[PDB]
Amino acid sequence: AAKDVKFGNDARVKMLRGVNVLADAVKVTLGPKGRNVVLDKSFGAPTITKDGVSVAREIELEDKFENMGAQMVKEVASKANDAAGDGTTTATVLAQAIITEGLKAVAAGMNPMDLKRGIDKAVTAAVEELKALSVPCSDSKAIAQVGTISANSDETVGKLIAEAMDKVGKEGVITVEDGTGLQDELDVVEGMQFDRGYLSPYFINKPETGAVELESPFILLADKKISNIREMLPVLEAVAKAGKPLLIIAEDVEGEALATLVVNTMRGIVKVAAVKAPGFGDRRKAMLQDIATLTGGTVISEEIGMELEKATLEDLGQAKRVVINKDTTTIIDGVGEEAAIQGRVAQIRQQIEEATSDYDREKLQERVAKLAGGVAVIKVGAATEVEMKEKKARVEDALHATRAAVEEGVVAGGGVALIRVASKLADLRGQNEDQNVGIKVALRAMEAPLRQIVLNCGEEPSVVANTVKGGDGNYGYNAATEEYGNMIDMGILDPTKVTRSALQYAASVAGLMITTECMVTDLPK
Amino acid sequence: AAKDVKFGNDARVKMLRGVNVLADAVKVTLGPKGRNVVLDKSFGAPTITKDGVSVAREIELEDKFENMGAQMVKEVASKANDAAGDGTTTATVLAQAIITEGLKAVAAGMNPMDLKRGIDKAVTAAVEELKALSVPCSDSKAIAQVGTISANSDETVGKLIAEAMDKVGKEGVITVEDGTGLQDELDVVEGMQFDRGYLSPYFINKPETGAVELESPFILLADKKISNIREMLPVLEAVAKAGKPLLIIAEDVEGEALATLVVNTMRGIVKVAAVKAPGFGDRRKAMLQDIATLTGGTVISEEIGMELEKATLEDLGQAKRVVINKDTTTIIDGVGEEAAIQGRVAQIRQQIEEATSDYDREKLQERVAKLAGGVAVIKVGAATEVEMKEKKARVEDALHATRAAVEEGVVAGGGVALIRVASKLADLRGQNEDQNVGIKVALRAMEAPLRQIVLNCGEEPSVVANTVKGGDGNYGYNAATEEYGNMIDMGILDPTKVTRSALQYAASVAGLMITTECMVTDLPK
Amino acid sequence: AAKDVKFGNDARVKMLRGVNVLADAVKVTLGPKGRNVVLDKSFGAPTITKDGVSVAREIELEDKFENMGAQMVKEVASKANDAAGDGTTTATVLAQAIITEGLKAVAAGMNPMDLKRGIDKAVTAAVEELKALSVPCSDSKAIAQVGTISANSDETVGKLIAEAMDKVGKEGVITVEDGTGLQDELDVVEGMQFDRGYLSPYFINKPETGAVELESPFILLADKKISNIREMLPVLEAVAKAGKPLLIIAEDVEGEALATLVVNTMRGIVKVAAVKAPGFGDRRKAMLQDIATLTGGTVISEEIGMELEKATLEDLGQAKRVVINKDTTTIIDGVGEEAAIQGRVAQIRQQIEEATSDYDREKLQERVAKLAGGVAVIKVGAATEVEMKEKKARVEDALHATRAAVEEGVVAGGGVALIRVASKLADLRGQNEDQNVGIKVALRAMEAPLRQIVLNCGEEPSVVANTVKGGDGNYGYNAATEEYGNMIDMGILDPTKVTRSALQYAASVAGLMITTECMVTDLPK
Amino acid sequence: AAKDVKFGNDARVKMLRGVNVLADAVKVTLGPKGRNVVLDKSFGAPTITKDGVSVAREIELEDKFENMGAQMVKEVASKANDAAGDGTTTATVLAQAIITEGLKAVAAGMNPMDLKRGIDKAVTAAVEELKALSVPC
Ligand SMILES: Nc1ncnc2c1ncn2[C@@H]1O[C@H](COP(=O)(O)OP(=O)(O)O)[C@@H](O)[C@H]1O
Ligand SMILES: Nc1ncnc2c1ncn2[C@@H]1O[C@H](COP(=O)(O)OP(=O)(O)O)[C@@H](O)[C@H]1O
Ligand SMILES: Nc1ncnc2c1ncn2[C@@H]1O[C@H](COP(=O)(O)OP(=O)(O)O)[C@@H](O)[C@H]1O
Ligand code: BEF
Ligand SMILES: [K+]
Ligand SMILES: [K+]
Ligand SMILES: [K+]
Ligand SMILES: [K+]
Ligand SMILES: [Mg+2]
Ligand SMILES: [Mg+2]
Ligand SMILES: [Mg+2]
Ligand SMILES: [Mg+2]
């Protein structure tokens, strides 16, 4: 199809307009006191929200080049959120600040390479200072405090998270489910987790979380590529009985069988979830065999000459609950008999004793840790049902926050860590008058989060920013109570990973947009 | 799809225009002497109404942003009506007054946060004063007078309501049905009510009330999630015989089964009503078993290994009449034999004697109260049929009014309670010159109901408002007779819940619109 | 359909506009530091790329004559890339330079014949000088260095390529496959390669490479033209069992059977790849028989009176892996037993001893070398999977580079060889004042690659070009480190075939455009 | 009459565009290998000239902000012709170069008055050096 092509400043102005529209819509919700955005709906009353993810989801522009700019910033913010677990609006704010200043500089006649170099060196220095500023969070008390803070001053949630990480290790697997009464019950079962997501996004039955959930499902353990429906039709017919879902774990499922399964799921004949087998090479079969032993199943591989046609319900495995994420699959409470679990664990342990390679033994300890660690289950108790659901959501968010906090520590919240590092780095210089303009652009953009937070609350950003810069350590401004104080003592924290990820991804997208020479899109016809 | 995005005053002006159109259309019907609105119809002659609910239902705007404003106000007015049982037009009037003044203030340069704070504190003070004014209505005589007033001076309606509440308790279940002759007959049967509405809005066969009604229906007591039609085809086939409706009470019905049932109901092959089982956790099965023993049925649960395929008409329960609301299900006159119900009551009573927790014994007290209280039935007698239907509607509205009156008491009607509180609070002050503008906005908007009532009747609002403010207590203006006097003695009352709900929801929507920074809607294409 | 016809300068201006748009979009990505081009996508976030092939693929123009110019340059650039393995962007840059200057000269009144003659003689002289500069690369050490350089300083890739070419000869067959662990394993099996591509482009299941890949496929060895499906239904029905793909190698497949096979592949019933038999005449049957012996099959020829209807799985051959390219078919690890292979080799060797013609014996040595050489397999080992895939792609590109390097040697990269030859040929003269304008146009366009590389890096092209011209030998500019030095020592090489092919194809397309008198296209309706 | 008001960078880019139009017309005639400019005259035949002030006195633009820029830069050539009788193309070239680099420095956040003071100091020192560098003729 015929294309529209733009070069140079003509492309830059369109990207700048799109970025400004997106960020202007999204940034008014930053902080604890964000303003309201009314999002229209096809039918009924609109949606009034203070969340930036929701606002960014429904932002689409009629002009194609401005739409390119908006989508470019949006997908980088999504990447930052995925990597860190939080920080979409902050990353968007940083990206807009850097992009606006840098594109103004480029339009004046400066060398884009020098600006990009200055921005990159400023960001690297800031990241080093951020590492210097961070304080470790590894002991139980700090973990509980971080959980309570992330649960909006809910001490029970932090208590449960601390108990779970003390039970199954801080690097283990934790899952939350619905409870029965008002009691928060925690228990340990046998399971494992491997990083393979669903093959198609059309299998998702929980759009609230964007994940696939199965209750007491059968699993097909095929060590081959699925190529024809005729191979799986008897298995599908057997699964249709008793009304139980089926989980497909095989080497790969290509177009025709994937389309058949997607159509079946949409019309609801049989609910099927498909996931690729973990790993590759000769270790993939070991991973699959460990899964089969955990779930008490049988591996169907062409090497043994086994056919999916002659497969009954016996060969399938059974698990209590299975959760499939975008890029992660969790198996919880397999029915595989436990003495067989001990026998397999002992066998691979003896293999470990025979390991002669560093990488090989590392993979073997990975396998034994996955197989013998188990998973932790936290059951949410409440009086009514809606509060139980929102409490479960709070527990999930607190788990995501606590994982990053344990990974890299915590820094003062409210946007004051970036102010600390920017005030530290005020002496940084570049080799060129254009690399100096880039260094000033990146350091000026670290005050944007706190300034926008104070602006949303309704005070004067300049006075509060000056007062915070004048202080030292964790001195900062509490937006909820409109008073100053030590941010740690007021319980306003951010994990270091969130801040670092947001800053780095904003700088990345800004550098990509600064050195862009052409944009090609379809005609507006 | 591409979106249109507006910021700031550009959004505020559009919301203001939409709110003005909606409220100007709806407020001319307020009071006993409202004017006429001519609503067009697809075919034939128009509809002429003095009711604001009907007028608000058919208001749409061609401009998208103004339509967002109108729908925003309409949805909050509907919330107020649902919470209090009455007060849609009053809530719309209060909301328009506050929104207009506050948006004018915001456009002039005042700070939205301070305005919202002033409005909120004025409303809280008004609510406290309204609680101060209210007088109790708990004894039988006051209940009878409130019922008579709510039934347009119909003493028989109040007599029946007072008898029913003295019979089955002021917090019991009361239902009204069609009678046989001219006699108003009241009787007590065995029944239960639980707060679970219909699964889909397409099951409603009575658009006049917006409720589902079933006569002698069978009930399916399934303690499992229903997902495949093949589980229920035999049961549906059995139900199709004898031409009796079926009510589904289960854990949940997912996409395809719900769609199949909706299609079957729409084409009328079998009339089916679907409703979710009450509660959750381990108590949900207790409630389901109590329902089963009430209606003489059998619980079909996968734990016992029972299948819906091998289910005949025997396992189903039978009830004389079942009514389903938007969020409430009522079962009247179950065929369950009384000795089984009494033995169940004794069993849970012995459980209560063994209760060791306050909230646990609270659930148990709720259960025994629901199971042993029963329901009251009021049968409407009249000479003709149209008169009987109109009297039944009057009885229903009187029941809704009397419930709120018992819950929170009564205050003088005609809009004079709000004048009383506004005149009381004339000394209230704020911390800022912008919080003072907010306080004056909220207190000035409390005279809007009485002024609009007097304007609709045809007098001068200012003279009557001044005369009423001059008085004290229950002194007020009768719009029907154009005469002053004591409101209580002339029988013009409002429940305190209606006034409080209208004021609070109006202030809520006004605060939402004041602090709105962006509006995103689809392109007009 | 009605056409639009343009003559002379009206056609030239449109072609010039199209060529300018294409080259302006594509050339900003040239070198190690090319800028970014944002390519819109139908859904989601755009594509940001620094690769000229991707940018050139998605360029279409709304104007039809300008689109002729763009497609004309694009197709010749693709030819150059196919012939040399690299040099699409460089060929585009050279073509644009020559075309622009030559068309400017033509529009002024100079004779197109003389301009074309001058350009042709300048290019021939440059090719001779480029042959003079080239340094041979045939010994193992130079091969290893060339492989390492082409693999981005990856010594293991070069080591593997050198080992493979030392095993199976520098003119042998090399194939890369996915490995198992982290070990790079190299082995030799029995196979052959013949230059026959897929019959239809719809059989390709690997759009990343644009090739057909089959795993353990059956092959149909038919020595006749296939035209009726009824001949080939039973064989496909047999093939559908066990879910194995089928490779069709016959004299030719006409419209009906090819369409049926394409439809079957598209809907995924049976995966079929079709290829024409190699050669022609009486040698074609000998080649087909050699393939059949290699794969342990049976030739189905009408001369023996064999029918495809009475063909079972026995007559088909089996191979471990088969790869089909655009114009090349590779058979790897046939199941043909080795003693039969040796007997066949001895038989054709005895035939060679009886050869009495030079060309005939040349065909016989071709046959024996292809039959007895075998193929080399290189297996890529890595830790993760994405790394393994990227490394395999790097190995493939290094193989393409090393083949050309062995074929013709290497010259200094960065565009300094063309500067060397242009500075050598500054004394060249033509017979006419119009042939002198053509000679200056061709020599001025040889500095365009280095100037564009330096422009993309951010320096001043004139100063760097002058410094490079002042030097001698392999002195040149390193764009990655912005430092001068000897190009060989910094490891910036470029095969002579790539440069020669790019220059020649650019001159060809320029000469075609210069002597073009008319352009016929469809109406814009 | 009614007026049009432009603030900041918009004004500066319009002004620089006008400066560039006039300077690009004038600068093609500089040196031993400069060329001629044909000037249309309402009364008579066109004049073919290689003089800087003759070309500069002729330029007027359609846009009014760009016309302001051109009208301001024209005074350099006018004054140079009035004072020395020669050297007007060189003056125009220098003025355009200074304006371009100064606007680049201003867009980087510098104070224009301090830049102006620095330019003045540099030019004063330069004139002293030029006086020191001459020889009698
Ligand atoms: N009470 C508070 N006072 C000041 N800043 C706060 C407070 N609570 C949270 N914050 C800060 O506000 C930010 C949260 O903004 P949010 O809307 O969550 O955007 P994001 O999704 O990008 O994190 C965090 O950086 C946090 O440090
Ligand atoms: N005879 C009367 N004189 C004065 N006011 C009255 C009289 N009867 C009812 N009202 C008042 O009119 C209001 C009823 O208006 P209505 O049209 O029902 O609006 P809504 O549905 O919002 O209550 C009540 O607040 C009531 O106090
Ligand atoms: N480090 C370097 N310094 C200078 N020139 C380089 C360097 N690396 C590669 N080149 C040159 O850049 C060219 C590669 O450009 P490329 O984007 O690959 O275009 P093409 O696809 O036409 O080869 C080669 O001619 C090579 O000689
Ligand atoms: F143009 Be100047 F007068 F030499
Ligand atoms: K928020
Ligand atoms: K009315
Ligand atoms: K490149
Ligand atoms: K001159
Ligand atoms: Mg957040
Ligand atoms: Mg009413
Ligand atoms: Mg290349
Ligand atoms: Mg002169």
Numbering used by the authors:
A (entry chain I), B (entry chain H), C (entry chain J): 2 to 526
D (entry chain G): 2 to 138
Task: Please give the exact wording used by the authors of the publication that reports this structure.
The bacterial chaperonin GroEL cooperates with its cofactor GroES in assisting the folding of roughly 10% of newly synthesized proteins, including proteins with α/β topology that fail to fold spontaneously. GroEL is a cylindrical complex of around 800 kDa containing two heptameric rings of 57 kDa subunits stacked back to back. The apical domains mediate substrate protein (SP) binding and the equatorial domains mediate ATP binding and hydrolysis. ATP-dependent binding of the lid-shaped GroES (a heptamer of 10 kDa subunits), capping the SP-containing ring (the cis-ring), results in the burial of hydrophobic surfaces on GroEL and displaces the bound protein into an enclosed chamber.
We performed a similar in vitro analysis on encapsulated MetK, by both cryo-EM and cryo-ET, for comparison with the in situ cryo-ET structures. Encapsulation occurred following the addition of GroES and ATP-BeFx. Reference-free, two-dimensional classification demonstrated the presence of EL–ES2 as well as some EL–ES1 complexes. The latter exhibited subpopulations with wide and narrow trans-ring conformations resembling those observed in situ, with density for bound SP in the narrow state.
